[PDB]
């Protein structure tokens, strides 16, 4: 089957930036490619058909280029409402195959995360589930690595990471590493440390606290 890969999975570019997105085609698609815009939260937008021509109701800042197997949707200037996932779909043979997708961000603020730690509450203790949350606030570079050391033991498999969408004010998010334990494995441990590493952050820092 025609398998199509987006060469960039995510690019960061401020407003007023020329942007080119490349889609790779497994086999010759003579002139059958569609560029779709998807802002998470609504039916997507049909942007380009045949990889070159503009769907009506679309700004001319979007341009389609390519043929054969090289295909590049081009945006003349980025806009506040130009940041969305882009999908390349072939119209050549049988089932539509959709490209991987591309994420757009901005260099608006490069900020180190402000790291917080919050232990389980006394009533969350009567609950029987103990949960320490390490919060990284207002950090922009999408890449960050978080790990947990409970009593110098590397915890894995029971903590989950959440993040919001663009604040539209600082291009940063709030990241929560919610680490969950039970009383049989919580009251026997004292140190609860979150190891956070961010390129925007200078050095990997830790929120360490002692239970009780």
């Amino acid at each position: 089957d025609i398998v199509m890969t987006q060469t960039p999975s995510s690019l960061s570019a401020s407003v007023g930036d020329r942007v080119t997105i490349t889609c790779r085609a497994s086999e010759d698609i003579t002139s059958y490619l569609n560029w779709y815009q998807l802002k998470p939260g609504k039916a997507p937008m049909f942007l380009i058909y045949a990889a070159s021509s503009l769907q009506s109701g679309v700004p001319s800042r979007f341009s389609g280029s390519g043929s054969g197997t090289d295909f590049t949707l081009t945006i003349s200037s980025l806009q506040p409402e130009d940041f969305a996932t882009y999908y390349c779909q072939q119209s050549y043979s049988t089932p539509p195959t959709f490209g991987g997708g591309t994420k757009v961000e901005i260099k608006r603020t490069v900020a180190a995360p402000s790291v917080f730690i919050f232990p389980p509450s006394d009533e969350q203790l009567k609950s029987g589930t103990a949960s320490v949350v390490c919060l990284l606030n207002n950090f922009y570079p999408r890449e960050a690595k978080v790990q947990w050391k409970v009593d110098n033991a590397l915890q894995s498999g029971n903590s989950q990471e959440s993040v919001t969408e663009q604040d539209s004010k600082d291009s940063t998010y709030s990241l929560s590493s919610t680490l969950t334990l039970s009383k049989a494995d919580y009251e026997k441990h004292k140190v609860y440390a979150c190891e956070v590493t961010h390129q925007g952050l200078s050095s990997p820092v830790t929120k360490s606290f002692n239970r009780g």
Partner: protein, 443 residues
């Protein structure tokens, strides 16, 4: 073992789609014998004005048969892609007594193409292709539709200008989409009209090449080729199996304009054919030239008695299926297409059964086993009364050299009930088996 030609060198087989929903239409063309639809002529006779009864292999009156239809393949602008086929290859039908095929009935008319309903093209005649064999299984994937041993294959070639029949062993192939390989949807066959079907240069191996793409035919006993004129006339085809081989019938040569089938080939196949299926065939053209193809209808052949009207030409143009309804009984009994007005008694209905009522221990066979079996003149019996039994359990412990049941069957003597069983046993050599019979002069 005849030489058919070189194998197929391509690694992968073309991809195929099965949209059975696209082919589901209702275009009834039932058999009606009032104009002699699907009639096989007597093999060695002809007749004149006379009207006679005749018993042979016929399709039952009013039968709808099975409709099959062929289509173009996936085509982009000027480039053909994946083939389009139904589930005919996976489906396995049974060659109980052979079948008759109606070909190009819808030709010379314009109908919407099945593959693209919005597109409309003048219906044109196409010829069916069949695989027939004696053993069926699934492929590796569990997909039904594999013919194991020597299987007869009939396929049209050169855009319907010749027919090829051959009795080969088909082994699948391991390439992509090839039936022994991976990502296999369904085998098919195809011909591309841009190259294969050029004017005056009909590639006569194109469909054979398509077939060899998916199978490596081996140990081919024979191969036969029959030339076919091009036209757009309704025609009939027939296949049957006798001890003399398989017989091929057609209306093409003798009764081109009437439809009576006459034998035109006998093939040296002698293993009883039990199964058959229709080979899907897709026409590898461009969407701008998508043409519509007439559906072919397959009607099974049943032993039947038919009142046949023969013209001075001897051609059958009228028939009666004597077992269709009561009026047909009258026509067949008076052996005429005209019966006088009256009130005639016909065969009566009878009710259907349900709920077989039953009412009714341990017939023992221990003394059969303990001791020495006495002599054939000191033979000892076991009567059985007021008990129930099983004979297979007793008989599986031994090795029966002879089992001959008179006035009774070997299955019944294990299953029927009666008043009393008498089982006499003794010691008997196998040398004097001939003396042990009801009709013998032995001591």
């Amino acid at each position: 073992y005849v030489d058919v030609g070189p194998d197929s060198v391509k690694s992968a087989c073309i991809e195929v789609d099965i949209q059975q929903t696209f082919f589901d239409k209702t275009w009834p063309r039932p058999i009606d014998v009032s104009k002699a639809d699907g009639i096989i002529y007597p093999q060695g006779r002809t007749y004149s004005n006379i009207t006679i009864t005749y018993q042979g292999l016929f399709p039952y009156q009013g039968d709808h048969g099975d409709m099959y239809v062929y289509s173009a393949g996936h085509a982009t602008g000027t480039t053909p892609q994946k083939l389009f086929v139904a589930n005919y290859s996976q489906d396995v039908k049974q060659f109980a007594n052979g079948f008759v095929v109606r070909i190009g009935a819808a030709a010379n008319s314009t109908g919407t193409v099945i593959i693209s309903p919005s597109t409309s093209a003048t219906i044109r005649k196409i010829y069916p292709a069949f695989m027939l064999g004696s053993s069926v299984g699934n492929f590796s994937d569990g997909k039904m539709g594999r013919f194991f041993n020597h299987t007869l294959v009939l396929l049209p070639d050169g855009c319907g200008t010749l027919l090829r029949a051959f009795y080969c062993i088909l082994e699948p192939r391991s390439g992509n989409h090839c039936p022994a390989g991976n990502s296999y949807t369904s085998f098919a066959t195809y011909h591309t009209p841009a190259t294969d079907c050029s004017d005056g240069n009909y590639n006569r191996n194109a469909s054979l090449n398509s077939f060899k793409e998916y199978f490596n035919l081996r140990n081919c006993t024979f191969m036969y080729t029959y030339n076919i004129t091009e036209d757009e006339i309704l025609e009939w085809f027939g296949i049957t199996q006798t001890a003399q081989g398989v017989h091929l019938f057609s209306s093409r040569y003798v009764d081109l304009y009437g439809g009576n089938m006459f034998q035109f080939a006998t093939l040296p196949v002698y293993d009883t054919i039990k199964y058959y299926s229709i080979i899907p065939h897709s026409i590898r053209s461009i969407q701008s030239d998508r043409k519509a193809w007439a559906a072919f209808y397959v009607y099974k052949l049943q032993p039947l008695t038919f009142l046949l009207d023969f013209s001075v030409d001897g051609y059958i143009r009228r028939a009666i299926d004597c077992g269709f309804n009561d009026l047909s009984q009258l026509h067949c009994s008076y052996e005429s297409f005209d019966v006088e007005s009256g009130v005639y008694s016909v065969s009566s209905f009878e009710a259907k059964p349900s709920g077989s009522v039953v009412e009714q221990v341990e017939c023992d066979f221990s003394p059969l086993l303990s001791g020495t079996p006495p002599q054939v003149y000191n033979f000892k019996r076991l009567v059985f009364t007021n008990c129930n039994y099983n004979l297979t359990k007793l008989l599986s412990l031994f090795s029966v050299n002879d089992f001959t049941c008179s006035q009774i069957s070997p299955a019944a003597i294990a299953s029927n009930c009666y008043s009393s069983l008498i089982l006499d046993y003794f010691s008997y050599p196998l040398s004097m088996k001939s003396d042990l019979s009801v009709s013998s002069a032995g001591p």
